[PDB]
C-alpha cells in the first residue's frame, strides 16, 4: 500500500470513512460550522477516490496526518492557529483540546426532528456525528459510528414515544469520559501499564482462553487504543474491525458467549463483544500459590522474562476473581513485583516470598468491607437519604469545596449505590469501579481548573490505581474555620412546596451542605436532630393555610432553636 487513504477507503468503505474523517475534523476544530466540516470531508473523499483509481496519482503517497493536516490549515483562526501553520510532522492539536464551551444542544421539537430526518436523513445523521464530537473530543470513533446507528434506529421506529434519545446521550457522556481516561492513562503511565490493565480485563472476561490467546488480543487492543488516542482514527476502526473479525473466527478458543454477538452486523458486533458477559470460569485449575508463591523457581522463572511472569500472575488471578476490580488486581500485581524484587536478592528468598498472600489480604478486604458498609447504609436509607449521609461525609472531609459541586458529587455517588447494591455481592466491585472512575475523572479535571485543596490534588495525580483509595484515605478537615452565619441561605419559602421532587431535594441538600460548613463540629446525632426538625418544619408549613407566613414564622423559630444547639 503506497496510498494510505486508498488502503483505508478500500477497507473502511465510503460511509465509514466520511464519518470517521468528520469526527476527526470535528474533534480538532470544535467551534466551527457544520457547513465547514462537510466541505472539507467532501474534498478529502473526492481526493480518496482519485487514489483508489490511481495510487500513482499525486499526493496519494503523502501521510494522512499531512493530508488531513493540510486541509485543517486550509481555513484563518481568530476563534491553536500556530500549529496550523504546518500540519505537525498533532501534539499541538491535542492538549490544545478542552475537555470542558458550547451551548448545550437544545433538541428541536419531535415532529420537527422527524420531518427533517425523513426529509434529508443523511444530513440529519451527519449533524449528530458533528455535534457529539465537537462537544466530546476523546470519544472512540468506532463506538460513535454505532451510537449514530442507534440514533437512526430510534428515529425510524419512533417516527407516543424519544426517552431513548435521552438515554443515548447518557451512554455517550459515559463512553466519552472513559475513553479520555484511557487515553490519558496510557499517555501518563505508558503502554506497559495499559497492557497490564487489558490483561486483567480480558482474562476476567475469558478465563477459558489460553494466556497466549489473551496476550495476542492485548497487543491488538492496545494498538487500536494507542491510535485512537494519537487520533489518526481510521486505523482504529480498521484495526478494531480486524479484532472483532478475528475473535468471531476464534470464539471456540475464547468464549462460549460470543455466538449471539458474532452474527450481528459489522458495526454492532464490535460493541457487543466489549459488553459480552464473562464466561464460566474453568475447572481443574491449581492454586495460585503453586506456580507464583510455593515454587522454589520463582526468582529464576521471573528472571527469564519479568513481564510475561507478571502477566501470567495477573491473568491467573483475574480468571479466578471476576468479582475483584481491575484496579485491585493491578495493585496486587504491583505488590507481587515489589515482593519479588526485595525477596530475590535475599538469603532464603522463598521464605520471604512465602508470606506474600499475607499482603494481598488487606488490599482485597479494604474495598470489599468498604462496599458492604455503604451498601448496608444505602439499603436502610435509600437513594435520597443516603445522598444526604454522603453530603455530610464529604463536606466534613473537604469543606473548602464549592457547595453546588458537593451536591453534584453526592447525588451521583448515591445514584451509584442504587446501580451497584441492586446487583448481587459478586458484581459490585467491577460495577463500582466502572461508575466511580468517571466521577473521580471529572472531579479531578475540575479541581485542576479551580484547585481548592492540596490533598485532593495529590490524589488527583497519584497512580490511577492509588486514587480511589487516596480519596478514601481523606480524613475530616480539622483546621477548617466555620463559615459565617447567613440568614438568606437558611431561609425558605412557599415555592419549595410547589417545586418538583428533583428541584426540592437539591434545594434541601444545598442547605444541608451550608449547615455543615457553618457547624462542622456537630455530631451526626445532633445533625439528625436538625434534619428531623427541618422535615417537620417543611411538612407543617406545606399544609398551613398561609404557606408563606408559616415559612417565615416557623423559619425564625427553627433557626433560633438550632443555633441554640451549637452549645
Amino acid at each position, epitope marked *: 500500500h503506497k496510498s494510505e487513504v486508498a488502503h483505508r477507503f478500500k477497507d473502511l468503505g465510503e460511509e465509514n470513512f466520511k464519518a470517521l474523517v468528520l469526527i476527526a475534523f470535528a474533534q480538532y476544530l470544535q467551534q466551527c460550522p457544520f457547513e465547514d466540516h462537510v466541505k472539507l470531508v467532501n474534498e478529502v473523499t473526492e481526493f480518496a477516490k482519485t487514489c483508489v483509481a490511481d495510487e500513482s496519482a499525486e499526493n496519494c503517497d503523502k501521510s494522512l496526518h499531512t493530508l488531513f493536516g493540510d486541509k485543517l490549515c486550509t481555513v484563518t483562526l481568530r476563534e491553536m492557529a500556530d500549529c496550523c501553520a504546518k500540519q505537525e510532522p498533532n501534539e499541538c492539536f491535542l492538549q490544545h483540546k478542552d475537555d470542558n464551551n458550547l451551548p448545550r444542544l437544545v433538541r428541536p421539537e419531535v415532529d420537527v426532528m422527524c420531518t427533517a430526518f425523513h426529509d434529508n436523513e443523511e444530513t440529519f445523521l451527519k449533524k449528530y456525528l458533528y455535534e457529539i464530537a465537537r462537544r466530546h473530543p476523546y470519544f472512540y470513533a468506532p463506538e460513535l459510528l454505532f451510537f449514530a446507528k442507534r440514533y437512526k434506529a430510534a428515529f425510524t421506529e419512533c417516527c407516543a414515544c424519544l426517552p431513548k434519545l435521552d438515554e443515548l446521550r447518557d451512554e455517550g457522556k459515559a463512553s466519552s469520559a472513559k475513553q479520555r481516561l484511557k487515553c490519558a492513562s496510557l499517555q501518563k503511565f505508558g503502554e506497559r501499564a495499559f497492557k497490564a490493565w487489558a490483561v486483567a480485563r480480558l482474562s476476567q472476561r475469558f478465563p477459558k482462553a489460553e*494466556f497466549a490467546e489473551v*496476550s495476542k488480543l492485548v497487543t491488538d487492543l492496545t494498538k487500536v487504543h494507542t491510535e485512537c488516542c494519537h487520533g489518526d482514527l481510521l486505523e482504529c476502526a480498521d484495526d478494531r474491525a480486524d479484532l472483532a473479525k478475528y475473535i468471531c473466527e476464534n470464539q471456540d478458543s475464547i468464549s462460549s458467549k460470543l455466538k449471539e454477538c458474532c452474527e450481528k452486523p459489522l458495526l454492532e458486533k464490535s460493541h457487543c463483544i466489549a459488553e459480552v458477559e464473562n464466561d464460566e470460569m*474453568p475447572a*481443574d*485449575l491449581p492454586s495460585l500459590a503453586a506456580d507464583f508463591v510455593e515454587s522454589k523457581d520463582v526468582c529464576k522463572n521471573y528472571a527469564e522474562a519479568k513481564d510475561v511472569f507478571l502477566g501470567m500472575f495477573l491473568y491467573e488471578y483475574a480468571r479466578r476473581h471476576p468479582d475483584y476490580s481491575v484496579v485491585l488486581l493491578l495493585r496486587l500485581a504491583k505488590t507481587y513485583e515489589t515482593t519479588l524484587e526485595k525477596c530475590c536478592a535475599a538469603a532464603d528468598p522463598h521464605e520471604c516470598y512465602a508470606k506474600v498472600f499475607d499482603e494481598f489480604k488487606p488490599l482485597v478486604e479494604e474495598p470489599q468491607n468498604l462496599i458492604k458498609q455503604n451498601c448496608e447504609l444505602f439499603e436502610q436509607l435509600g437513594e435520597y437519604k443516603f445522598q444526604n449521609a454522603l453530603l455530610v461525609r464529604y463536606t466534613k472531609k473537604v469543606p473548602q469545596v464549592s457547595t453546588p459541586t458537593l451536591v453534584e458529587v453526592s447525588r451521583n455517588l448515591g445514584k451509584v449505590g442504587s446501580k451497584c447494591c441492586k446487583h448481587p455481592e459478586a458484581k459490585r466491585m467491577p460495577c463500582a469501579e466502572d461508575y466511580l472512575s468517571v466521577v473521580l475523572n471529572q472531579l479531578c479535571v475540575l479541581h485542576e481548573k479551580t484547585p481548592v485543596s492540596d490533598r485532593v490534588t495529590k490524589c488527583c495525580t497519584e497512580s490511577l490505581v492509588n486514587r480511589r483509595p487516596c480519596f478514601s484515605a481523606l480524613e475530616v478537615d480539622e483546621t477548617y474555620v466555620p463559615k459565617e452565619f447567613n440568614a438568606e441561605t437558611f431561609t425558605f419559602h412557599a415555592d419549595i412546596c410547589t417545586l418538583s421532587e428533583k428541584e426540592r431535594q437539591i434545594k434541601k441538600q444545598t442547605a444541608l451542605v451550608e449547615l455543615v460548613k457553618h457547624k462542622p463540629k456537630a455530631t451526626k446525632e445532633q445533625l439528625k436532630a436538625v434534619m428531623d426538625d427541618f422535615a417537620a418544619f417543611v411538612e407543617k408549613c406545606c399544609k398551613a393555610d398561609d404557606k408563606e407566613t408559616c415559612f417565615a414564622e416557623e423559619g425564625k423559630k427553627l433557626v433560633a432553636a438550632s443555633q441554640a444547639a451549637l452549645g
Partner: nanobody
Framework: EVQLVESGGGLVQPGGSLRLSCTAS????????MAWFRQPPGKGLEGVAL????????NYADSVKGRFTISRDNAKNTLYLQMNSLKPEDTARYYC???????????????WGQGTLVTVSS
C-alpha cells in the same frame, strides 16, 4: 503456528526406563498447561500426567503414580516424561498436549502432537 514434537519412544525391557521429550514451537509456547496422554492399543486417549506452566503443580493417572515423573524446561521449550519401572501394560502411543487448564480431558486441549510409540516387552 504452535507445533508440538515428541521423541524418545521405542522398545524397552519390562522393568526398564524411557524419557520422552516434547519440544514446543510457536508464540508463548512456555506459558501453557501441558499434558501427556497415552493411547493403549485399540482404546482411546487417557491422561498419564499433567503439569502447570512453571511446574509448581502436577497431576498423574493412578496407573503410573510412583513410577513416572513429569517435568518442563520452559527455556528449552521442551516438556519431559521420565518413565521408570516400565510394565508391558504401559505399551501405548504417547502424545503431547497443550491447553489452558490442569484437567485430564481430551476436549479441553487445543494443541496436540503426532505421537511417539512406546513398546514394552522382552
Amino acid at each position: 503456528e504452535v507445533q508440538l514434537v515428541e521423541s524418545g519412544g521405542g522398545l524397552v525391557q519390562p522393568g526398564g526406563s524411557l524419557r520422552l521429550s516434547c519440544t514446543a514451537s510457536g508464540y508463548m509456547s512456555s506459558t501453557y498447561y501441558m499434558a501427556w496422554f497415552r493411547q493403549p492399543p485399540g482404546k482411546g486417549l487417557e491422561g498419564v500426567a499433567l503439569i502447570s506452566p512453571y511446574g509448581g503443580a502436577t497431576n498423574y493417572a493412578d496407573s503410573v503414580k510412583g513410577r513416572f515423573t513429569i517435568s518442563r524446561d520452559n527455556a528449552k521449550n521442551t516438556l519431559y516424561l521420565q518413565m521408570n519401572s516400565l510394565k508391558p501394560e504401559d505399551t501405548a502411543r504417547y502424545y503431547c498436549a497443550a491447553g489452558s487448564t490442569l484437567t485430564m480431558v481430551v476436549a479441553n486441549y487445543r494443541y496436540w502432537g503426532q505421537g511417539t510409540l512406546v513398546t514394552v516387552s522382552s
